[PDB]
């Protein structure tokens, strides 16, 4: 796993997905911190969001564990920062990379999947009152991530 992790780390340092970064926490190559700039096509615009990544022993055959550290208001991300995203569980493949995972999370921020929520209340608001949803998502962004 370590050689693969070093490869990715280098491939990310030189060509990160737009508006993202990621690298090790101190000396520990199996524990990374990443950042995503809130996409301009999302109510997270202007915010900077920190994530934690922990690689399993059998990486890249098992997915990395990825969670938000920065609080965020989103149907698919809960108060523990857990993220409901298929490629982080059933649809993981070693052909995927942290770079691709970050891009996928950016896409998720622009376009939630309210029919597979981690937070039913937010999912309800998203589906019934998008105006309210976007307002609250912006409000949390401004208070916590800006």
């Amino acid at each position: 796993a370590l050689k693969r992790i070093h490869k990715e780390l280098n491939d990310l340092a030189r060509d990160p997905p737009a508006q993202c970064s990621a690298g090790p926490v101190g000396d520990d190559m199996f524990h990374w911190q990443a950042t995503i700039m809130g996409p301009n096509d999302s109510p997270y615009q202007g915010g900077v969001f920190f994530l934690t990544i922990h690689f399993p022993t059998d990486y890249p055959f098992k997915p990395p564990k990825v969670a938000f550290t920065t609080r965020i208001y989103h149907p698919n991300i809960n108060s523990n920062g857990s993220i409901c995203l298929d490629i982080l569980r059933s649809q993981w493949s070693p052909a995927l990379t942290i770079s691709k995972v970050l891009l996928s999370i950016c896409s998720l921020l622009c376009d939630p999947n309210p029919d597979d929520p981690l937070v039913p209340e937010i999912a309800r608001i998203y589906k019934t009152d998008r105006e309210k949803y976007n307002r609250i998502a912006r409000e949390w962004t401004q208070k916590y991530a800006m």
Binding site: L2, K3, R4, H6, K7, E8, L9, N10, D11, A13, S21, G23, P24, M29, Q33, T35, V48, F50, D58, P60, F61, K62, A67, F68, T69, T70, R71, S79, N80, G81, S93, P94, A95, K143, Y144, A145
Partner: protein, 110 residues
């Protein structure tokens, strides 16, 4: 000859002395890398019950023993050496993170 691309499992390319294979879906992997993938996937499918190409999901035909027999590729670890620019950016990040902490914006998981 030798493929010009990279084994998406290990992220290294192919070298003339390496054992690699090509799937019927036109994707190349080191034999060793693909063997590890298949072994893992076989265990996973069993624990819930058709190993697919990691790239395109086409079902693979293979003989695991034959892939395993092949020599593991010799690949030097790629050193991590952050540029001066990334170190600068990392410092700005620390500043942002500190503000988020102060705001109660950081999840603890006590």
């Amino acid at each position: 000859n030798i493929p010009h691309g990279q084994c998406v499992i290990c992220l290294y390319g192919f070298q003339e002395k390496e054992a690699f294979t090509k799937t019927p879906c036109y994707h190349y992997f080191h034999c060793h890398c693909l063997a590890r993938y298949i072994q893992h996937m076989e265990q996973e499918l069993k624990a819930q019950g058709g190993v697919q190409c990691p790239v395109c999901r086409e079902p693979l035909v293979y003989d695991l023993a034959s892939l395993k027999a092949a020599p593991e590729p010799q690949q030097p670890m790629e050193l991590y050496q952050p540029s001066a620019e990334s170190l600068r950016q990392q410092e700005e990040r620390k500043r942002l993170y500190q503000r988020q902490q102060e705001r109660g914006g950081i999840i603890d998981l006590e």
